[PDB]
Design a protein around this ligand. Structure first.
Ligand code: NA
Ligand code: NA
Ligand code: NA
Ligand code: NA
Lengths: 460, 216
DNA sequence: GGGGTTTTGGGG
DNA sequence: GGGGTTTTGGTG
DNA sequence: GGGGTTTTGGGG
C-alpha cells in the first residue's frame, strides 16, 4: 500500500488511491434511501490545510471525503475533531472547485480511525487504555492491518495534528455562524459553542444549554445514545442545526439525523480559548424565576468543587440497585440530580429543631431553646428522569446535626419561630424547590439506608 | 406568537387539563395541512410539525362517498382540509407509540376532511415529530408534575420523618435503601396514573384496516 | 454464487 | 457530496 | 479483476 498526500493525489488517474489524513469535520452517518448510507467529512494534511493567506483571512483549506455504504455500521462515527483517518481504495475527482475523495465501503474501500490523543472519545468515556499507539479504535470490515512502515506516517501525522490544532483554529469563522445571528439564516448552519449545562430531559434525551462567543444562549436536544460524550464546560462544534421558529419561551436549535456534535483534541487552541473566554450565564434562570411557569429548566444548586469530577447516579440505581449492584455497594458517597415534589415537615418553621446530642433526640422549638443545639431536619421527596414514570417518590434527607449540608440553604440554622429573616428566606427557597422545572444537583452520603445531602448549596 | 398551529393547539389542550372545551375557540377553525405520509403511518404537517390524525369510521365512509376516485392511503404529498375535528388526551405506551410522550398522547380526532387534490403548498422547513419538540415535551412534563404533586400532597401526610437517631450514631447500624421509597399515590400498578383529566374515548380506525378496505 | 464493476469471461 | 431513514419511527 | 468463499468454473 502506497500512501499519497492530499495535494499530490492524481486528478486524472481516476485509479484507486490511498492516504492518511486529519478529520476536522464530519456529518453523522445518515441513510439516503432503502439501501444507501453516507458520511461526508472534511480532511487536511501538511500539503492541504490552509488557503492562500494574504487575503484569505487565515481561512482553512481542505479536501472532502464521502464514504458510501449499505449498512450504518460500515461508516465512521466522528465524535472529535483532530483524530486521524486512514482510507484505502478511494477515487479522487474535482467537485465544485475542491478535491473530493469518494469511497464505496460496500465494495472494496475501507477506513480506519486512529486516536490523536492518548485515548479515543469512547475510551475516555469508559476510562479505558488504548491497546497501543498503532491500534485503530474503529475500522470497517472484520480486519485491519498496520505495516511497520506505517508507524512513522502515523506518529508524524499525530505530531503535525497537534501542532496544527495548537497553532491554528482549524474551525475558522467561515465554518460556523454566530448564535445571535442564527435567526437570519435561510436554512441550516453550523455552531461552535461551550456546553454550559447538560439537563437530562428524559430516558433517551439530553437538553444542552449552549453559549458561544456572541454571548447568546441556546438550547438543543441531544440523544444520549447518539452523543454520549457531551460534558459540561466543554466546547463542541455542532454540524448542521436550524433555528426553531416555534419556540417562544426559549431559543432552541433543531438537529437532524445527519447532524453531529464534535469535541476538540486537547491541543485545540480554539477550544482552549473558548473554555476560558465563554463564561457561565444565569440570566435565563434569573428571569424564569419571575414567571409562574417556566419552560426553562433551572438547577438551583451547585456541588463543592471537589465533586465536580464525580459521576452522577440516577435515583433508579440509588434506591433500586444500591443493595444488589456490586459497584454501588462499594460506594457510600454519590452525586445525583432530581426535582423536589414535596418537602417535610409541611410547616417551614419546623424545619429547624432542637437537638440533644446525648439522647439522640430532636424536638420542636415552639417551646424555645429548651431542646438543645439547633439543626436542620428536612426531608425531601424527590423524583427524576430514571423514575419519571413509576408511582414512586424518594426521600432525600437534610439532617445537619453532624454538619452534613449545614450551609445548604445559605442560612445558618436558627429558631424559625423567632427569626423572621431566616424564616422568610427558607420559605422562598421552599417555593423555588417545589416549582416545576426546578432541579437539584447534589452530593449525598449513604447512612443506615438513607441518603443525606452534603457539600451542596443553593445558588439562588 | 406561536407559528405552529399544531403546537399551539396541543399545548393549550395540555395546559387545560386535556379539556378540549376550554381551549381557545378561535383555534377550532378548519385545518389545511400537507400530507407527509399515508402508509404505514398517515402523517400530516402544519408547516412545522407532523401529527397523526385519527379517522372515525364515519369520516372515512363520508370521504369515500364524496370522493370515489380518491384513496386515502395514497394521499402522500397531497393536501387535505379537516373541517370537523376534535382533540382529546389518551394514555398510551410511548415505548410503542412514537406519536406520544411520557405515556400520554394528544389525539387529533378527524370527523370530516376534504382532499384539495393537486394543490401545491408553500415551501417549509422539514416537519418534525411534535412529541419530540423541547417545549412541547416540557409542557407535558409540567402536566405530569402538577398531577404528581397534587397526588403526593394528598397521599403523603403525618410528616413521617426518619427519626434523627437512625441517621445519628450509625456506626453499628446498617440499612436498606428501599426504606426511602414512598408511594406517590393510591395507584393500582407500579406506574403513576392518578390523573384528574378524564381519558377521552372514541372508536378510531387502524390505518391497516383502511388499507384493506381499499386494496385487500 | 453473487456484488460491484466493467473484468462483460475467467483467477486463485 | 451541506444531507431526510424507520424491523431504527428517542444513534441511523 | 479481485473478495470471500466454495462457487473450486462461470452469471448478470
Ligand atoms: Na465476477
Ligand atoms: Na464481472
Ligand atoms: Na468470482
Ligand atoms: Na470463487
Amino acid at each position: 500500500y502506497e500512501y499519497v498526500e492530499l495535494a499530490k493525489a492524481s486528478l486524472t488517474s481516476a485509479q484507486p488511491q490511498h492516504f492518511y489524513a486529519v478529520v476536522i469535520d464530519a456529518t453523522f452517518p445518515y441513510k439516503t434511501n432503502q439501501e444507501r448510507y453516507i458520511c461526508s467529512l472534511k480532511i487536511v494534511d501538511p500539503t492541504l490545510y490552509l488557503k492562500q493567506q494574504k487575503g484569505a483571512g487565515d481561512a482553512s483549506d481542505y479536501a472532502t471525503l464521502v464514504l458510501y455504504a449499505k449498512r450504518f455500521e460500515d461508516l465512521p462515527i466522528i465524535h472529535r475533531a483532530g483524530d486521524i483517518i486512514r482510507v484505502h481504495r478511494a477515487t479522487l475527482r474535482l467537485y465544485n472547485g475542491q478535491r473530493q475523495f469518494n469511497a464505496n465501503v460496500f465494495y472494496s474501500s475501507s477506513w480506519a480511525l486512529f486516536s490523536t490523543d492518548k485515548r479515543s472519545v469512547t475510551q475516555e468515556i469508559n476510562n479505558q487504555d488504548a491497546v497501543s499507539d498503532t491500534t485503530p479504535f474503529s475500522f470497517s470490515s472484520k480486519h485491519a492491518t498496520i505495516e511497520k512502515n506505517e508507524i512513522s506516517i502515523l506518529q508524524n501525522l499525530r505530531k503535525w495534528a497537534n501542532q496544527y490544532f495548537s497553532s491554528y483554529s482549524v474551525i475558522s469563522s467561515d465554518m460556523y455562524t454566530a448564535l445571535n445571528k442564527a435567526q437570519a439564516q435561510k436554512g441550516d448552519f453550523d455552531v461552535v459553542a461551550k456546553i454550559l449545562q447538560v439537563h437530562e430531559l428524559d430516558e433517551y434525551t439530553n437538553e444542552l444549554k449552549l453559549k458561544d462567543a456572541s454571548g447568546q444562549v441556546f438550547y438543543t436536544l441531544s440523544l444520549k445514545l447518539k452523543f454520549p460524550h457531551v460534558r459540561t464546560g466543554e466546547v463542541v462544534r455542532i454540524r448542521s442545526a436550524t433555528y426553531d421558529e416555534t419556540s417562544t419561551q426559549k431559543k432552541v436549535l433543531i438537529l437532524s439525523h445527519y447532524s453531529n456534535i464534535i469535541t476538540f483534541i486537547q491541543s485545540s487552541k480554539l477550544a482552549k480559548e473558548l473554555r476560558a473566554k465563554i463564561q457561565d450565564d444565569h440570566s435565563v434562570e434569573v428571569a424564569s424565576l419571575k414567571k409562574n411557569v417556566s419552560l426553562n429548566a433551572v438547577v438551583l444548586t451547585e456541588v463543592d468543587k471537589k465533586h465536580a469530577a464525580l459521576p452522577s447516579t440516577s435515583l433508579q440505581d440509588l434506591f433500586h440497585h444500591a443493595d444488589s449492584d456490586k459497584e454501588l455497594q462499594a460506594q457510600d458517597t454519590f452525586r445525583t440530580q432530581f426535582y423536589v415534589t414535596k418537602i417535610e415537615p409541611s410547616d417551614v418553621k419546623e424545619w429547624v429543631k432542637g437537638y440533644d446530642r446525648k439522647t439522640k433526640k430532636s424536638s420542636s422549638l415552639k417551646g424555645a431553646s429548651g431542646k438543645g443545639d439547633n439543626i436542620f431536619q428536612v426531608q425531601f421527596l424527590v423524583k427524576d428522569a430514571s423514575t419519571q414514570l413509576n408511582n414512586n417518590t424518594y426521600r432525600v434527607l437534610l439532617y445537619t446535626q453532624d454538619g452534613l449540608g449545614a450551609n445548604f440553604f445559605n442560612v445558618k440554622a436558627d429558631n424559625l419561630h423567632k427569626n423572621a429573616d431566616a424564616r422568610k428566606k427558607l420559605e422562598d427557597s421552599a417555593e423555588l424547590l417545589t416549582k416545576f422545572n426546578s432541579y437539584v444537583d447534589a452530593v449525598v452520603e449513604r447512612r443506615n439506608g438513607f441518603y443525606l445531602i452534603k457539600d451542596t448549596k443553593l445558588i439562588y | 406568537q406561536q407559528q405552529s398551529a399544531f403546537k399551539q393547539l396541543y399545548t393549550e389542550l395540555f395546559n387545560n387539563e386535556g379539556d378540549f372545551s376550554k381551549v381557545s375557540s378561535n383555534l377550532k377553525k378548519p385545518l389545511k395541512c400537507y400530507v407527509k405520509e399515508s402508509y404505514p403511518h398517515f402523517l400530516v404537517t402544519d408547516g412545522y410539525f407532523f401529527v397523526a390524525p385519527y379517522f372515525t369510521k364515519e369520516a372515512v365512509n363520508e370521504f369515500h362517498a364524496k370522493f370515489p376516485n380518491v384513496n386515502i392511503v395514497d394521499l402522500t404529498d397531497k393536501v387535505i382540509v379537516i373541517n370537523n375535528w376534535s382533540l382529546e388526551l389518551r394514555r398510551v405506551n410511548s415505548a410503542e407509540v412514537f406519536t406520544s410522550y411520557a405515556n400520554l398522547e394528544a389525539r387529533l380526532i378527524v370527523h370530516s376532511f376534504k382532499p384539495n387534490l393537486q394543490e401545491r403548498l408553500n415551501p417549509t422547513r422539514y416537519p418534525v415529530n411534535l412529541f419530540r419538540d423541547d417545549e412541547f415535551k416540557t409542557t407535558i412534563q409540567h402536566f405530569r408534575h402538577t398531577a404528581l404533586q397534587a397526588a403526593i400532597n394528598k397521599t403523603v401526610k403525618g410528616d413521617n420523618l426518619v427519626d434523627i437517631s437512625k441517621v445519628a450514631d450509625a456506626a453499628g447500624k446498617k440499612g436498606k435503601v428501599d426504606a426511602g421509597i414512598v408511594k406517590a399515590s393510591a395507584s393500582k400498578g407500579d406506574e403513576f396514573s392518578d390523573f384528574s383529566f378524564k381519558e377521552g374515548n372514541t372508536a378510531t380506525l387502524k390505518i391497516a384496516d383502511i388499507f384493506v378496505q381499499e386494496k385487500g
